[PDB]
Design a protein around this ligand. Structure first.
Ligand code: HEM
Ligand code: HEM
Ligand code: HEM
Ligand code: HEM
Lengths: 141, 146, 141, 146
């Protein structure tokens, strides 16, 4: 459960992402494909080369969804509804993979907003990313 | 796989009692029924809408027997699993695009199947050996992933 | 989430366990200790020999708890409220361990109830055990 | 683990820039804050009720320095992490009773601290190599559990 302190922190760090959100999503992706090559099994149709347009483009999609989750941290299920359906009924990404991407987002953030990535903020972001994965995997069965 | 000669005796001994075609179509069916996201690879198989539709599906059945047939040959090379499954690993990675997690899920389901079928003959120490075996097969099938 | 069908399947199969719950709980525990040796790190005070009375006593407690969750399939978070506090604040069992026990629980039922362990029931019981695990680890952080 | 010579040279060259005392204190501290349940093994350390108390705890950074020191020294025995950690593995199993899943948690926490400290130098390719290293260390630390 995201406590009031968590929401505060998540809203603080994400606020410091701003216009770079699309870039961080794209960095998170490259990190994941490289660190966990099994994840590439879901993007056979992508060009996975460094700086591919498909990757960059996709990085922003994910980024925007996260921002939307943050703006709606209090009503996550209803905000991510359509995406929950999407992943559960079409994409069918195995739940374990959400943990891999979540990690790469943390790394990306850590390497970009050093002052803000304090231990407690680190804790908050991890809880938040866990909540979002939980929301996207809730309609699986 | 690190299996003691009492664990290897146990595995082979019980496998000798297994009906591969039957057990194969059974493990694959329950996988598709219990973890429905796994269906993402079988849309050419037809109707997988209900448990009975999945289980009685002739394509599901024919594929489960093919999968287990392969598994059985792995069983004759516990000391050379990587080598045994080398070509299949490349196939599932490069051609099929099967996330390795799927192999681990099928392994646990298979274990539930052997238990359902052998009853008390599937003792705690026998399960422990099969778990090392299914883990070994999952790792071998995922070794060529890149 | 547990659909009405899942609830009926769970009530039906647990009903069959009847008085053999404790015995099945103990067996599940022995199956886990053998198949997943790392799980033994949480019972370093326990006698873990075949037929250990400590293991038989714990199997019963676990079994009793599952029976209580089935009896309250409609209000599990509250029916298992005490156990959540316990696992979160005192025992602190890493969440991955619930997956291992759940699986051994499933093998035990599979081995004792071949008539009722259909793919439909198998599916439902797995979801049940997962929802229990989730309730027991909800207050960890 | 097998790191390509250009992967090993990327690991090695960043490790030379590491202040082990600080980083080890940062890594173990964060582990206890992000994942509170890991605190079960460290209750004699004192007050860990708040993040600041955890980060400030003398016993914690002293232990962190202890742990990362071991890690550090293993990075030179990359060729044989199993033999390098064989005795420590027995110790965490038989004496300390540490669930190996904790080695994985720490490993990921460590990778986050490095990124936090090296920012732009911790490139995706460099992160990829370190992920292999921490998975290798976690696997070596657990090989002697029974
Ligand atoms: C933090 C969690 C994640 C979020 C917020 C998220 C969000 C999104 C969004 C918004 C889309 C685009 C849908 C559209 O076209 O409107 C998408 C697509 C997709 N996601 Fe997820 N996703 C997440 C995790 C994952 C993970 C872990 C994987 C697998 C490794 C994944 C694989 C996919 C795939 C394959 C697509 C479709 C790509 C395409 O063909 O364009 N997603 N996701
Ligand atoms: C225990 C491990 C497994 C073994 C030993 C195995 C074996 C096989 C074999 C021998 C083939 C046919 C090769 C060919 O067509 O040239 C194959 C194909 C295939 N496997 Fe696997 N497999 C395993 C697990 C799985 C699992 C768990 C999935 C995914 C849920 C999977 C999905 C597929 C698919 C999609 C095909 C191709 C089916 C088609 O359209 O013809 N396999 N596998
Ligand atoms: C979903 C299954 C689980 C249920 C229903 C469950 C239930 C219980 C119950 C009823 C107790 C006894 C409470 C008391 O009176 O002290 C307990 C204790 C305990 N559980 Fe859990 N538990 C579950 C899973 C786990 C797992 C996965 C582990 C570890 C691998 C674990 C480790 C412990 C330990 C160490 C104790 C204390 C044992 C003792 O000292 O007597 N539990 N659990
Ligand atoms: C992956 C890296 C790890 C390595 C290489 C490692 C290494 C060490 C070393 C060198 C010691 C010193 C023991 C002595 O002086 O005899 C130690 C002790 C200990 N380790 Fe680990 N450790 C690791 C991870 C962890 C984790 C994740 C935990 C638990 C959350 C843990 C818990 C302990 C405890 C409790 C002690 C202190 C024992 C005492 O107070 O006597 N270690 N570890």
């Amino acid at each position: 459960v995201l406590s009031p302190a968590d929401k505060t922190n998540v809203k603080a760090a994400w606020g410091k992402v701003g216009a770079h959100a699309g870039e961080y999503g794209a960095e998170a992706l490259e990190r994941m494909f490289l660190s966990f090559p099994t994840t590439k099994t879901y993007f056979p149709h992508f060009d996975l080369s460094h700086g591919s347009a498909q990757v960059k483009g996709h990085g922003k999609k994910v980024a925007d969804a996260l921002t939307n989750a943050v703006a709606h941290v209090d009503d996550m299920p209803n905000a991510l509804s359509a995406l929950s359906d999407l992943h559960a009924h079409k994409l069918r990404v195995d739940p374990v993979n959400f943990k891999l991407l979540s990690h790469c987002l943390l790394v990306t953030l850590a390497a970009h907003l050093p002052a803000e990535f304090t231990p407690a903020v680190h804790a908050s972001l991890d809880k938040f990313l866990a909540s979002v994965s939980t929301v996207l995997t809730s309609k699986y069965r | 796989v690190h299996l003691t000669p009492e664990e290897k005796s146990a595995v082979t001994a019980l496998w000798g009692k297994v009906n591969v075609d039957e057990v194969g179509g059974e493990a694959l069916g329950r996988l598709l029924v219990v973890y429905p996201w796994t269906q993402r690879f079988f849309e050419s198989f037809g109707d997988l809408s209900t448990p009975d539709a999945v289980m009685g599906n002739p394509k599901v059945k024919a594929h489960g027997k093919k999968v287990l047939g392969a598994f059985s040959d792995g069983l004759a090379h516990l000391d050379n699993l990587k080598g045994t499954f080398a070509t299949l690993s490349e196939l599932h990675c490069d051609k099929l695009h099967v996330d390795p997690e799927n192999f681990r899920l099928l392994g646990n389901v298979l274990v539930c199947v052997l238990a359902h079928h052998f009853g008390k003959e599937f003792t705690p120490p026998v399960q422990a050996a099969y778990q090392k075996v299914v883990a070994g097969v999952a790792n071998a099938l995922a070794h060529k992933y890149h």
